[PDB]
C-alpha cells in the first residue's frame, strides 16, 4: 500500500489508470505492427518489411517502460491478451496478407488513433506527474516520426 | 498461389494450420511472461523477475520464426490480438500482483501446456514436413529447459 | 563572472544552490548504495548485491551531470567529503553488515529522502530554469524506478 | 582410407556422391546470387541489391560446411569453375542486366530446383546418415525463407 | 497536407517556421565548428583541436534530428547553402587560421546567439507543441555544457 | 610560412586553391545529400532515405580530409556557409518534398558536376603533387560508384 | 518427482542413464583435450596446440548442455571426478609429453570410442526423446569434422 | 632436458610437483563447481546458479595457467581423470541434487581445503621460485574472495 | 547508355573489357583457394588450411568491387560458371587431395598467372582511366604479399 | 565469526583495520578527484579534465577491491560519507575553481600522502597476510604513476 | 631465388634496396616517437603524450608492411639495433627530458628528413613498381599530415 | 629533482639505473623478435610467422611500462637507436633468412640471456622497491612462457 514520495495517493491511482490504457494500446500496437512485418507483399517490399522491425523493437521497448512505471506508482499492470483486449477501444488490424500501400495506409490511422491519445494522455498528465510525462512525450516524438516515414511511402507530388 | 516445390498444397495448408495455432501459443507466452516480469514481488524478486526476459526475447523470437515460415508455406499468418484469443484453448492467466512462487507455480503449468501442444505437433508433422519439425523441435529444447529453471524454484529436498 | 544567455545572474544563482544540494545528495547516497553493496548477507544474496551496482554507476553518473552543470551556470561545485557532510541534514546510514531484508527496509527511506527532495527542487525550477529541470526529472525516473525494485523485495501477497 | 566410425564404407560413400553434388549447387547458386547482386536495375533497386548479399555470404557458408563435411568422410571435395560446371544439370543464369522484376522472377525458378533437389536429397539421406541430415534441413530452411522474400516480391492481392 | 493528431494546422506551421530558423542555425554552427577545427594553432593545439569532433558530430546530429521532425509536421526543411545563408541573422565566422584563444574566444560568442535563440524558440513552443519542446530542451542542455568548455579555456584565478 | 619538404611553395600555394575549391563542393554536396534525405517521398522512400546516409557521412568524410590537407600545405581552408557559396559555380539543389525519381536524377546530374570538377583536378595533379592525387582519386572511386546507385534507380530495360 | 510433459516416467529415466553417460564421457574428452594440448611437442607445435582449445571450449560447452539437459528430465547428473572414472569403459590417455603426431593419432581414437557410442545413442534415442536426438546429433558434427582436423595432419599423399 | 634459466634443476623440479598438485586441485574443483551449477534447487535458485559460472569459467582459466607454467619448467603436466583421481587427498563431492543452502555449505568446506593448500603452496614457495608465487598468490584472491560470496549465503544477523 | 562524366564511350568499354576478364579470374582463383582449403593434407595441415580463408573471403572482396566497378562504367559484369570458364585462359586447378607441399607450389603458379595478368592490365590502365587503376594496383599488392606466404613455404637455406 | 583458513583471528583482524584505512583513503582521494576535475580553468583545460576521468573511475575501483576483500576477511567495511570524515587524516581538498597548476600541484601533495600511507601499510603487510599485499602493491603502481602524470605538468626544464 | 612476376632481377633488386633504407628510417622513427612519448615535459603535456602513441603504433605499421614487402622481393629485410645504425644518415634524437616547444620543434626536422627521403623514393619509383609506389605514397599523406600536427603547436598569429 | 615519497634519492637512482637497462633490453628482442618475424621460412612458416607478432606487441608493451616507470622515478629514460646499442651486450640477431629451426634456436638463447638478466634484477630489486619488482616479476612469467613455446618446437621423443 505505498506510493511515490511526493504524489496523493489519488494523483497516483489516476495515473496508473492512464498508462494501463497506454500499455494495452501499446501492446496492440506492437503485435499489430509485427502482423504487417509478416502479410506484407509488394514491389518494393523489403523497404517496409525490415523499416518495421525497429518500431516494434521499440513500442515493446515503450511497454516495459510504462508497465514497470505502472508497478513502481503502486498498481498492479495487466499485460495479459484479456487485459488488453478489454482495454482497447477498436477493431484489431483487418487486413489479411495485402500490398504495401495497403498496409502503410491501414497502419496511417492506427497510429493516428495511438498519437491522439497519448497527446491528451500528456496534457491531462501536465497537473499530475510530470516524471509520467516527459516520458510519454518522449515516445510521442517516435511515435509520431515513425508514423511520418508510413506516410512518406503514400504521397504525391506534394 | 504457390508453396514449397516438394509439397502437395494439402499437406503444406495442414502444416500451416499447425504453425498458426503454435504462433498464436507463443504470443499468448511471450505476453503472459512479460506479465509476470511485471507483477512478481517477494524476497528473491530480482532473481526471477530478471530471469525472464530472456526467455522473453526468446519466445518472440520462436513467432517472427514460425509466422516468416507459414507466409513462406503459402497461408497467411495472424498476429493480431484477435487471431490469438480465438485460436487459444485457455483463460489467460488469472495472477495479478504476487509472490515469486505464485507465479512460478502457475507458470509451470502455463509450460506443461505449451510443450504439450509442441510436442503432439512434431510427431503430427513427421509424416507433413520435416523441416518445419527441426524447427518445433528446436523451441522444445529451451522450452522445456526454461521450465526447468521455472520449477528448480519450487523444489523440496529431493 | 559570466552565466547563461538568457538567465539573471540570481535565478541563476538560485539555481546553483539547489544543484549543489543536489550533488551532495548523490554522493552520499552513491557512496551508501556502496555501502550496503559490501555489507550485505542473507539466503538471496547476490541477487541484491549485483543489483545495486547498476543504480551506483548511475548515481555516480548524475553526479558529473549535475555539478558539470553547476559550473556551467557560474558557480563552484563543492564535493569533497568535506561539502557533503555539511550540505546534507540526515545522518549516514546506521547499518553494518546485516540482511538482505534490513538494508533495502533502511534503503526504502533513503530513497524517500531523495525523492521528496529532487521532487520540490523539481516544481521550484519550473519557474527558473527549463534545462537544469528536464535534467532533474529524468533522474526522478530512475531513482524512483530503482526504488520500486528495493521495495518489490519487501512485500507481502498484495 | 578411413570414416566415420559407425557408417559402412559404402553407405559413406554414397553420401559422399549426394553432397558433392550439392555443393556444386551452392556454388552455382551463391556465384548467380552475386551475378544478379551487380546486374539488377530498377525503381526498388536498393532494396533488393542489399537483399541478397546476406542470402549469398550464406550459401557460400553452406559451402565450407558441406565439402568440410565430405572430406570428414573420406572422399574428396571438388569445387573448382570446373566441377561444378560438370556436376549441375541447367543453364547457368540467362540474365544479364534487366529489372528487378526480371531476375527475381528467374531467380524463383532457381531456388525451386535448389530446393527440390535438397528435398529429395534428405529423404534419401534418413536411411543413410542422420547427421548429413539435420545439416541439409538446417539449410533448407534458410533456402525456402529467402526464396520467399524472392516471391513476396512478385505478388498480386492474394 | 497532413499533420499530427492534435495540432491545429496553424499551430503546426508555426512551429515549422520556427524550427526551419534553428536548422540553419545548426548547419551553421557546426559546418563553423569544422572550420576552427581546422585552422586552430597554438601551444594547446591537439587539446580544442579534438575536443570540437564530438561537439560537431552531435550538432549535426540535432541537424537530422530537427529536419526529420519538421517534415513529420507536414512543412519541408530546407538545408541547401542557400537557406541557411537567408535564415540567418549574423556574419560567418570571421577567422581565419589563429590562435586557440582566439577561436574558442570568438567561438564562446557564437554560443551566445545560438542559445540565446533557443531559449526563446523553447519558452515560445510551452504553449505550441510539447514535443517540439522536450526536443529542443535536450539540445540546450548539452550546447550550453560545451560552450562551458569553450569558456573553461578563458578564465582566471576565480 | 612554411611547407612540405619537396613542394615549391607556389606548386604548393597552386595545390591548396585546387583543393579549397573540392572543399566547398563537398559542403555543398553532403549539405545537399541530407537535403535529399530530409525532403525524398514515394513508394520506395526508406530504400532511398537510409541509402544517402552513409555518401553523407562519407562526403562529409572527405571533407575534414581535404581541409586538413589544405592547412598542411601552408594555406587556411574556408568551411562558413560564406566561403562556400562563394568557391561554387552552379545553384543550390533546386527541389523541395518531391518523388524518390525526382530527387535522384537531379541528384544524377549534382554528382556529374562532381565527378567531372574532380576528374580534371586529379589530372592537373599528377604535376603537381602526387599524395593530394592518391587523395582525390581514391574519392573519386565512391562518388563515381554512389551515382551508379543513384542511377541503377532510374534505368529501363537495358 | 516431476518429468517432461509428454514423456513416461520410464522412457524419461532411460534417456538420462543414457546422457549421463555420454557426459562422463565429454568430461573425460574435454579434460584430455586440454592434457595433450599442454604435452604437445614438435616442429608445428603452435598449429596443434591452438587447435584443440576452441574443440575444449566446445566440448565444455557439451557438458552444461547434457547435463542441464539431465535435470530437466528428473534425473540427477553426475560430474565429479569420481562419477566419471566409474562411467567410463578406457583408461585415460596414456600419453605424457611426446610428438605431435603421437597425440593426434592417440586422440584418433579416443574419438573413434566417442563419435561411435555416440552414434549408437542417437539412434537408440529416435524412439525414446527426439528432442534429446537432434541435441546429441548436432555435437557428432562437429565432433566428427574436429576428428577429420586430427586426422588430416595424418594422412600420405591420397 | 631444459629449465628456466636461473633454476637449479632440483628446485625446478620442487616446483613442478607443488603444482602437478595444485592443477589436479583445480580440476576437481572446477568440474566440482559446475556438478553443483546443476543439482542445485530452492527458491533463490537463479542467483546461485548463475553465480558459479564464472568461478568456473576462471578456475579452469589457472588450469591452464598453473600447466602451461609447469612444462615451462620442464616436467611433463598430468590433467587426466586419472592423474587427477591420485594426486588429490579427498572424496569427490558428496552432494546431489540438493538445496542452495546445502551446497553452498558444503562447497564453503571444499574451498577451505583449497585455499589452504593454496597458502601453504606459497609460502613454501617463497625460497623456491618467487614467479610461479605472483602467481599463485593472484589465485588466492580470488578464491578467497569467491569463497566469501558462497559464505554470505550462509549468514546470520552478524 | 550512360558512362562516367570524363571518358570517352570508347575509353570507358575498354576498361570494362579490361575488368571482366580480371572478375573472372578471381572468381576462379577465389574458389580455387577454398578447393585447396579444402584438400590440404600433412603435418602442418592447420597451418595452411587456416591460411586460406583470409585471402579468400579478400579475393571474393575483390570480385565484389571489380565488378560493382564494371556496372558503375555502363557495361554488364558476368559472374555465372559459364561466363567464367569461358574468360579464363587456363584449365582449373588439376589438384585433388594431397600434401601442403603440392597445393602451394600449385598454387604458387596460379598466383603468377594471377599477378602478371593484373600487372600488365594496370600499366595498360595509366592511358585509360586512373582510378580503375588505384583499385587494381592495391589489389595486387596483398596478391603479391599473399603469395609470398605461399612461397615462403617452400623455400630452403637460403 | 569466521576467517580465511590460514589466517590468525588476530592477525587477519589487524589487516582489515588496515584497509579500512585505505578505503577512507580511496573515497577521499577519488571524491576529490572528481571535485577537480569539476573546477579546473586555464588554457589547457580539456587535457587535465579529461586526464582525471580514468584515474578517477580507477580508484573507485580499487574501492570495490578493497572493501569486498575487507568483508571476506570477516570485519565489515564502513564506507558512508560519516566513516570517511573520521578514519581520515587530513582536511578535505581547499581548492574552488582555480587554474589548472593550482589544483595539479595541490593534488600533487595529495597523492604524497596516499602514496606514503600505502608504501607503509605494504611493509606492515609483509608479515601479516601477502594477498592483501600483492593487491596494495599492484595499486601503488598505478597510484604512483598517476601521480607522474600530475607532476610531468609542473616542471621546470629539467 | 624467386622474383614478383613482372619485374626484372634487378628492378626488383634496386627497389629493395631502397625500401630498405625506409624501413631502417621507419624503425628509428618510431623509436624516437616512443623516446620523446616518455621525456616530454610541460603546461600541455598530456596533450602531446598522447598524441604520439598512435604515429607510433602507425609507424611500427608501416615497418611491418614495408618490411613483409622486401621479403616478398625476393631479399631479406634487416630490422636488428644494428642494421638500422648502419643504413641511417644521421644522429639520433639528441634530446632528453625537455618542454613540449623543445620536442616538438626537433620532431620538426625529423620528419622533414622522413618526408624528403621518401618523396625522392617514391619518384624514383615510379619507374620501378607502381606498386610499392602507392604503399610509400600513403604513408607520406599520414606522415606529412602528423607533421603538420607537430607543428600547428609552434605557430604564432599567421 | 622529485622522487616517490618513501624512496631514499639514492635507493631511487639504483633502480632507475636497473631499469635503464631492462629498458634497452626489451628495445633490442622486441625489435629483434619482428626481425625474425620477418626473415623465417619453412613448411611450417606460418604458425611460427604468426606466433611471434602477439610476443612483440606485448614486449613492446613492457617497454612503455618500464620507461613510463623511470621517469616517474626522476631519471630520464633513454630509448633511441643509440642508448639501446650502448646499454647492450651482446651482438644483435647475426641471422638473416633462415630456416624456422634457425631462428627458434637462436632465439632461444636470446631469452636465456634475457630471463636470466631479468631473474638477477628483481633478486637485486627486493631491497630497493618492492614495486618495480612486482613489475619486473609479471614480466618473466610471459617472458618465460613464451620461451617455452620456442622450445617447444625444438624438443625430440622426450
Ligand atoms: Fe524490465
Ligand atoms: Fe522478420
Ligand atoms: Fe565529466
Ligand atoms: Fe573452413
Ligand atoms: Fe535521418
Ligand atoms: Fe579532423
Ligand atoms: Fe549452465
Ligand atoms: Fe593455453
Ligand atoms: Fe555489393
Ligand atoms: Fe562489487
Ligand atoms: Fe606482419
Ligand atoms: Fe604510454
Known sequence: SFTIPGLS???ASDVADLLQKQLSTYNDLHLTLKHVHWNVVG???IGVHEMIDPQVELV???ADEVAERIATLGKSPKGTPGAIIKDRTWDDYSVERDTVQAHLAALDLVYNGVIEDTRKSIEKLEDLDLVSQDLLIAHAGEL???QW???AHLESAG
Open 9 to 11: 495517493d489519488k494523483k
Open 43 to 45: 514491389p518494393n517490399f
Open 60 to 62: 515493446r521497448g515503450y
Open 144 to 146: 509520431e516520426k515513425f
Open 149 to 151: 516515414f508510413v506516410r
